[PDB]
Design an enzyme around this catalytic site. Structure first.
Site, mmCIF file in Angstrom:
data_model
loop_
_atom_site.group_PDB
_atom_site.id
_atom_site.type_symbol
_atom_site.label_atom_id
_atom_site.label_comp_id
_atom_site.label_asym_id
_atom_site.label_seq_id
_atom_site.Cartn_x
_atom_site.Cartn_y
_atom_site.Cartn_z
ATOM 1 N N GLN A 146 47.284 50.440 21.270
ATOM 2 C CA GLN A 146 46.932 49.259 20.610
ATOM 3 C C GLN A 146 45.147 49.055 21.177
ATOM 4 O OE1 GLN A 146 47.756 45.375 21.924
ATOM 5 N NE2 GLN A 146 48.518 44.642 19.757
ATOM 6 N N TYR A 149 42.372 37.006 20.084
ATOM 7 C CA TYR A 149 41.115 37.719 20.367
ATOM 8 C C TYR A 149 40.028 38.015 19.220
ATOM 9 C CZ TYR A 149 44.208 38.549 24.249
ATOM 10 O OH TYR A 149 44.875 38.365 25.562
ATOM 11 N N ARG A 158 48.595 44.457 14.483
ATOM 12 C CA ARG A 158 49.403 43.197 14.897
ATOM 13 C C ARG A 158 48.679 42.095 14.506
ATOM 14 N NH1 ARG A 158 51.853 41.616 20.794
ATOM 15 N NH2 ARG A 158 53.750 41.826 20.051
ATOM 16 N N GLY A 203 59.431 42.880 24.185
ATOM 17 C CA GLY A 203 58.395 42.518 25.109
ATOM 18 C C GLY A 203 58.927 42.648 26.682
ATOM 19 N N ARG A 204 59.038 41.529 27.345
ATOM 20 C CA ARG A 204 59.361 41.619 28.687
ATOM 21 C C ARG A 204 60.728 42.637 28.970
ATOM 22 N NH1 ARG A 204 57.567 36.395 32.439
ATOM 23 N NH2 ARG A 204 55.225 36.608 31.656
#
Length: 348
Positions: free
Chosen positions: A96, A177, A224, A300-301
């Protein structure tokens, strides 16, 4: 179903479970992957596809301490070991590509300089720098002239990802971002060609994805996006118009996939995009796939705490919870010492 193989653009995936990009802040000297990181990813390589941690294309684009790079040979060579480790487990891994824009601190920037952004508006968030959490710095609005240079840093960063043995890249177009700062009017106050309308706000993101796709192939390019910001994210007056436009244009570039961090209409985006949709729970995910809403589901987590997450989702074994205090920074502990399921339980 979730556990059966599938293909993404060029490549073939063992299953439909994706490991989402997760920042860990454990890169070494020169933003080179730390010595345990190959292991970390190889431990989780039963994932159909791993998306690496967000990885800066330049130091300008660095926003958190000890995140890795993809712009120097040292970093490339560090990444080769990781792509090798993943591949030797039968896995897939995409890098990424990151530019944090205004979500940085002077301490991380070249010469202590101000972070860069479409407009000089500070974000109301903290970052992890000097081993603690501090407000991000006031950014400098980018000169129109610099933009092609940033598109080229992504272009070059994609070809470095292929040198490093990655199976493709994922442009980070989400989560506040650089590229999203341009896309959303809460942060893009420009009046030149990179702001002032849907089409202008969307220009950098699309230029960046187009250049990456040309350099290495659309079939190794993903992006993404996160249409709906959280409460403390970037305000966006009309994300539906904004992201219907962006996905139309992304589909036109022929890229392998969109990865969507999910009142908004995702079905619109799903309809507009003609290739893979990666959506970001086992039983709803299964229904979500059965329902035709997505082709892959990214977790994710859970991948932090369960290296054997795929196997456990498939067997029904309960899942380990995350130690949240060890996600960002530190050592092996809370990184590579999470047991597999057989090494977790007591019979009596």
């Amino acid at each position: 179903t979730l556990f059966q193989p599938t293909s993404l653009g060029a490549i073939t995936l063992a299953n439909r479970i994706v490991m989402a990009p997760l920042t860990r802040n454990r890169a070494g000297a020169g933003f080179v992957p730390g010595e345990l990181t190959a292991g970390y990813y190889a431990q989780r390589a039963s994932a159909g596809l791993i998306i690496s941690e967000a990885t800066q294309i330049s130091q300008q684009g660095q926003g958190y301490q000890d995140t890795p790079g993809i712009y120097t040979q040292a970093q490339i060579d560090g990444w080769k070991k990781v792509t090798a480790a993943v591949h030797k487990k039968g896995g897939r891994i995409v890098l990424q590509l990151w530019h944090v824009g205004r979500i940085s601190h002077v301490n991380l920037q070249p010469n202590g300089g101000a972070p860069v952004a479409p407009s000089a508006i500070r974000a109301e968030v903290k970052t992890f720098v000097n081993n603690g959490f501090v407000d991000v710095s006031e950014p400098r609005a980018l000169e129109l002239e610099e933009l092609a240079g940033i598109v080229d840093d992504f272009r070059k960063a994609a070809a470095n990802s292929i040198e490093a043995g990655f199976d493709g890249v994922e442009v980070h177009g989400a989560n506040g971002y650089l590229l999203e700062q341009f896309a959303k009017d809460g942060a893009n106050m420009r009046t030149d060609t990179y702001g002032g309308s849907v089409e202008n706000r969307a220009r950098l993101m699309l230029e960046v994805t187009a250049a990456v796709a040309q350099e290495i192939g659309p079939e190794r390019t993903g992006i993404r996006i996160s249409p709906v910001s959280p409460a403390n994210g970037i305000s966006c007056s009309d994300p539906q118009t904004q992201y219907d436009y962006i996905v139309d244009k992304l589909d036109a570039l022929g890229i392998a996939y969109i990865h969507v961090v999910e009142p908004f209409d995702y079905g619109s985006l799903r309809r507009r995009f003609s290739r893979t949709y990666i959506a970001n729970d086992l039983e709803l995910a299964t229904s979500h796939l059965a329902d035709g809403r997505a082709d892959l589901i990214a977790f994710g987590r859970p991948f932090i705490a369960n290296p054997d997450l795929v196997e456990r989702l498939q067997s029904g074994a309960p899942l380990a919870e995350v130690n949240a205090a060890k996600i960002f920074g530190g050592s092996a502990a809370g990184y590579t010492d999470y047991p597999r399921f057989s090494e977790t339980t007591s019979d009596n």
